Paper text:
Galectins are a family of proteins with some specificity for β-galactoside binding at their carbohydrate-recognition domain (CRD). Tandem-repeat-type galectins, like Gal-8, contain two distinct CRDs that are covalently connected via a peptide linker. In the present study, we used different conditions to crystallize the Gal-8 N-terminal CRD with its linker, and five structures could be solved. The N-terminal CRD prefers sulfated and sialylated glycans, whereas the C-terminal CRD prefers blood group A/B. In particular, the N-terminal CRD strongly binds to sulfated and sialylated glycans.
Author numbering: 14 to 161
Write the structure that this text describes.
């Protein structure tokens, strides 16, 4: 029901994903937003190069300034694509969360605390994703996977 679990990773976190993100796969991320957070992000990456920066198939980016939002996008050859902004965000400073990223055939389906949050259509085949990055102001209790 959950495997390859990593606990209290240091942020910034970069880790290799154990198996392939095929339709049906869940990525489960539990954490807490620090009282002073501006933003954090979960990036599903093709590799871990820093310079040049690895491509990001799915960038999921809660932001806390202003009214708060989540920005999602894809990074290819160090250039961002079209931004998808979700203004109804469940994240709050000083509150804990369970993010479930469900890989479907045509998109990611993301829920927080069991409530649907957003959809993100695949722009790169998810089979090419091999690295998970978590950056910014966030505390992560655990990262787990359930494949297929
Ligand atoms: O698209 C994700 C990417 O956005 C960058 O910031 C954008 C911003 O989100 C956009 O709404 C604003 O109007 O212009 C900025 C130009 O880049 C971030 O810098 C980056 O880290 C990603 O989050």
């Amino acid at each position: 029901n959950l495997q390859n679990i990593i606990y209290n990773p240091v942020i910034p976190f970069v880790g290799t994903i154990p198996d392939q993100l095929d339709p049906g796969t869940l990525i489960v991320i539990r954490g807490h937003v620090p009282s002073d957070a501006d933003r954090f992000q979960v990036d599903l990456q093709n590799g871990s190069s820093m310079k040049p920066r690895a491509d990001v198939a799915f960038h999921f980016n809660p932001r806390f300034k202003r009214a708060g939002c989540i920005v999602c996008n894809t990074l290819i050859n160090e250039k961002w694509g079209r931004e998808e902004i979700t203004y109804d965000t469940p994240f709050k400073r000083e509150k804990s969360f369970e993010i479930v990223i469900m890989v479907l055939k045509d998109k990611f389906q993301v829920a927080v605390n069991g409530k649907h949050t957003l959809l993100y259509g695949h722009r790169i085949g998810p089979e090419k994703i091999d690295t998970l990055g978590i950056y910014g102001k966030v505390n992560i209790h655990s990262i787990g996977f359930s494949f297929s």
